[PDB]
């Protein structure tokens, strides 16, 4: 939306979800706040410690 482009980085990978394992739950640290953390769904193959490019942190994951 009218939020500027955010950047947030992985702290840990949780497990794979979706109905073919195509989605991946992941925990991410906000990269400006070190006590803030949100759970996300990320499509692509990820390792740990890599940075994403979030368009919002209003969105939050809860299920497949």
């Amino acid at each position: 939306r009218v939020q500027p482009i955010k950047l947030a980085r992985v702290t840990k990978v949780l497990g794979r979800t979706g109905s073919q394992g195509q989605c991946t739950q992941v925990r991410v640290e906000f990269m400006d706040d070190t006590s803030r953390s949100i759970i996300r769904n990320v499509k692509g193959p990820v390792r740990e410690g890599d940075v994403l490019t979030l368009l919002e942190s209003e969105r939050e994951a809860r299920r497949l």
Binding site: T11, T34, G49
Partner: protein, 365 residues
């Protein structure tokens, strides 16, 4: 420092106020004077790899961290130029004040129409904090290795040792016609640091003339008769798992970016402080060294893990650092002191709150 009861506050210049103030279209500096000498870089260090590691030499040189009034060049150029005087480290702290978490302090000793920004000789001002901007920093006492003090000791001990290990002191130095004025030329040891001291010009508007010390640490051989000026600083580590960090040995090659993202959450103050210095200098390459403890319970033994050259200005485009903001900060502080009379005035950061002030003190306190 101790804040007394009889020191007069005028204004709380909090960090929300100062992150909006700006000054635009700062002109190209012209050097007033350049003094010292620089050593050349070893290109063998460009091919360092983790699994062929190389330890750290402790290299002692006789350093100069001289304050504004005691710096003879800043002292005498008062009579020809300027009306705000400082040194590179006193700039960097004021620039990067918005990310501070622990106290700093500078005695602005105004004189007549001019400002001597004197950092004290009994302060701990130029120590480089470790894990400072963390979720909860180390709260360990000064008897412990992993404390705020011992880690800053650790960090500041290593950062200049590796500045010279980068460099070939047994090979030719580029020499300025003016040698170092902080020590004599009867120092034939060549156990001075590789350093030269740019004294440079700026204007902030309001008929202000800033004449402040800046520097480089090393020059690197280029090609076609050109060379690459470098500020060298060094990223220490103590333990990964006690501050929510990354073990660089495991993750440097794959998660190169995540490592630097660690220290935008744990040492973000120090990162942009170093970058501010590099942009003040106008370096061609910003070099850093990756160093960690050889043994995580031994705060004395360390080992070099790698080196990576970034271009400081495209780096500033990446880390989201801009100096347009920065020159309104220093502007806003000069809005206070100029309309006041001469006197040792203290500008500091509160040790438990996020707000800086200008105190008027009875002088000599």
């Amino acid at each position: 420092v101790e804040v007394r009861s009889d020191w007069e506050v005028k204004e709380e210049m909090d960090f929300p106020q100062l992150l909006k103030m700006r000054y635009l279209e700062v002109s190209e500096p012209q050097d007033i004077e350049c003094c010292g000498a620089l050593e050349y870089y070893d290109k063998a260090f460009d091919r360092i790899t983790t699994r062929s590691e190389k330890p750290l030499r402790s290299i002692k040189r006789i350093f100069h961290t001289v304050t504004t009034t005691d710096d003879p060049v800043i002292r005498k150029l008062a009579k020809t130029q300027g009306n705000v005087f400082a040194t590179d480290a006193i700039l960097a702290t004021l620039m990067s004040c918005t990310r501070s978490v622990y106290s700093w302090d500078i005695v602005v000793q105004r004189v007549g129409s001019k400002l001597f920004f004197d950092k004290r000789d009994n302060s701990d001002f130029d120590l480089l904090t470790v894990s400072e901007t963390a979720n909860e920093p180390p709260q360990d006492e000064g008897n412990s290795f992993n404390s705020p003090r011992n880690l800053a000791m650790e960090a500041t001990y290593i950062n200049h040792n590796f500045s010279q290990q980068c460099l070939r002191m047994g090979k030719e130095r580029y020499n300025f016609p003016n040698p170092n004025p902080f020590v004599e030329d009867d120092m034939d040891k060549n156990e001075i640091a590789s350093v030269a001291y740019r004294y440079r010009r700026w204007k902030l508007g309001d008929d202000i003339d800033l004449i402040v010390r800046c520097e480089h640490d090393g020059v690197m051989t280029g090609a076609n008769g050109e060379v690459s000026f470098i500020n060298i600083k060094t990223l220490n580590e103590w333990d990964s798992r006690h501050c929510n960090g990354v073990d660089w040995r495991q993750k440097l090659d794959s998660q190169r970016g995540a490592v630097i993202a660690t220290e935008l959450k744990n040492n973000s103050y120090k990162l942009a402080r170093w970058t501010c210095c590099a942009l003040l200098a106008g370096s061609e390459y910003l070099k850093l060294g990756y160093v960690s403890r050889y043994h995580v319970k031994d705060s004395s033994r360390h080992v070099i893990l790698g080196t990576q050259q970034f271009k400081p200005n495209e780096f500033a485009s990446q880390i989201n650092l801009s100096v347009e903001n920065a020159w309104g900060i220093l502007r806003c502080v000069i809005d206070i002191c100029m309309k006041l009379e001469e006197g040792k005035y203290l500008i500091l950061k509160d040790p438990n709150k996020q707000v800086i002030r200008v105190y008027s003190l009875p002088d000599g306190t």
